Ligand binder design. Structure first.
Ligand SMILES: Cc1nc(Nc2n[nH]c3c2CN(C(=O)N[C@H](CN(C)C)c2ccccc2)C3(C)C)c2sccc2n1
Length: 293
């Protein structure tokens, strides 16, 4: 019975020796959620990022299976590409594309962004969001840490461990999942929510690009969880620094009324995304974040 859920996971993964298909292994990161290596596809000569997790020691097969499956059926230019999976010696190896420009968290916490650079990032993310939302997938963990950057300034979404599928029959969801500071109020208050929670988290992510961090970050997770549920729409520290069209975009991402809050399809047409700079204008941000590290 359990955990015979592994049979699905062992049926998912590709077979064969990952050692044979990839060489030039170099460690690039090592968090609590695994360790990332760079490597070269012996075939195409292409560079890949391989995440290695301890298995059991995390876990949870139900949701890590969900992560693989969801990525496979949801390929998009604005989503970090999933390549392969291999289970070797109680380790789950997930081969992903390599983005060398680091994360949006490096940028937002070490640099200042102009409205043109923020609009370019918001656009790419909404493009990924509209695609997932049309395929009835809710990310539920949108934050700057899950935005990866290409050396050319490419903006791509990652981390599908927390996503959830939806149907016309079950159009909502009720689990208190995600990361506290980015969580929509309707999620914090255990109400039935929809895809628009990702829109809220995008808005908080925009606040990151503005102020360097999401609201209440000095407070502890539970304290922040309380602050969100009571205050509703978060206040900017210096709202007047923003153009009126940026403030409008923000207010529509952070609208308490789910019905009034924008959808990804809607927000892609907003006048704030007009003044978007090309993605090349992100490379000095990237360069700046690298320095001071
Ligand atoms: C680690 C690292 N990755 C880089 N680029 C990447 N290319 N491809 C990928 C990454 C990072 N990735 C990733 O899954 N990171 C997650 C954390 N994220 C999701 C919140 C992670 C990091 C460390 C340990 C476990 C899990 C993938 C998509 C494989 C880069 S660029 C400069 C430094 C750097 N350091």
């Amino acid at each position: 019975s359990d955990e015979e859920i592994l049979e699905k996971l062992r049926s998912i993964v590709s077979v064969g020796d990952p050692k044979k298909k990839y060489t030039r292994f170099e460690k690039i990161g090592q968090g609590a959620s695994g360790t990332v290596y760079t490597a070269m596809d012996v075939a195409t000569g292409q560079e890949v990022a391989i995440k290695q997790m301890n298995l059991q020691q995390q876990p949870k097969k139900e949701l890590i299976i969900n992560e693989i499956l969801v990525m496979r059926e949801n390929k998009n230019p604005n989503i970090v590409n999933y390549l392969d999976s291999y289970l070797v010696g109680d380790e789950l190896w997930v081969v992903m594309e390599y983005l060398a420009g680091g994360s949006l968290t490096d940028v937002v916490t070490e640099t200042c962004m102009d409205e043109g650079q923020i609009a370019a990032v918001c656009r790419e993310c909404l493009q990924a969001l509209e695609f997932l939302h049309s395929n009835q997938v809710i990310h539920r963990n949108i934050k700057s840490d899950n935005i990866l950057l290409g050396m050319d300034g490419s903006v791509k979404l990652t981390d599908f461990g927390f996503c959830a599928q939806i149907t016309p029959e079950q159009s909502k969801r009720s689990e208190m999942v995600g990361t506290p500071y980015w969580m929509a109020p309707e999620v914090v208050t255990r109400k039935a929510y929809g895809p628009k929670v990702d829109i809220w988290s995008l808005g908080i992510m925009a606040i990151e690009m503005i102020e360097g961090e999401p609201p209440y970050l000095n407070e502890n997770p539970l304290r922040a969880l309380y602050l969100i549920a009571t205050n509703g729409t978060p206040e900017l520290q210096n709202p007047e620094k923003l153009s009126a069209i940026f403030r409008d975009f923000l207010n529509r991402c952070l609208e308490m009324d789910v019905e009034k809050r924008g959808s990804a399809k809607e927000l892609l047409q907003h006048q704030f995304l007009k003044i978007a700079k090309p993605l090349s204008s992100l490379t000095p941000l990237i360069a700046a974040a690298k320095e001071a590290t």
